Write a protein that binds this ligand. Structure first.
Ligand code: HEM
Ligand SMILES: [C-]#N
Length: 126
């Protein structure tokens, strides 16, 4: 049934996100963007998105614009689509390492994929 149960419940989601952030901060290309970001604060800010991500299907995300959220590191530090790809690799690795099957991982990653274009497509108002 629901994605949250299928992946193994809220304890698994928590550990996926924590492993995701461990991988992020250990990466020498992404640390440029994170060394001055409190990892606990960042996870807190990302929580609404993660709650939507493992929530009911089809519901559109209505939280803060992800381009706006990342626009400082884009303009000031060159955060690029290739850095976002690495982030998505690490989120997928975290799900794999905690035992989530590929069919579940593909479902989750397909929900996340549109947010690459969201972050990096210029919009009036930047
Ligand atoms: C790959 C390396 C990544 C870096 C360096 C990074 C960096 C950041 C930073 C610095 C913020 C802080 C924005 C703020 O506090 O105003 C943020 C917020 C956020 N990022 Fe990322 N990010 C990465 C990948 C991702 C990925 C893969 C996603 C998946 C969708 C994502 C989704 C979000 C969300 C939802 C927020 C919170 C927006 C809000 O405040 O509601 N980020 N990110
Ligand atoms: C992005 N955390």
């Amino acid at each position: 049934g629901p994605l949250l149960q299928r992946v193994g419940g809220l304890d698994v989601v928590k550990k996926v996100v924590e492993l995701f952030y461990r991988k992020l901060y250990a990466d020498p290309q992404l640390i440029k963007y994170l060394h001055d970001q409190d990892p606990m604060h960042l996870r807190a800010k990302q929580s609404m998105f993660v709650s939507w991500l493992f929530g009911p299907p089809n519901v559109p995300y209505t939280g803060k614009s992800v381009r706006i959220a990342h626009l400082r590191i884009i303009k000031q530090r060159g955060f690029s689509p290739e850095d976002f790809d690495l982030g998505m690799k690490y989120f997928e690795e975290a799900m794999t390492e905690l035992g989530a099957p590929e069919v579940l991982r593909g479902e989750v990653m397909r929900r996340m994929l549109p947010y690459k274009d969201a972050i990096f497509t210029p919009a009036a108002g930047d």
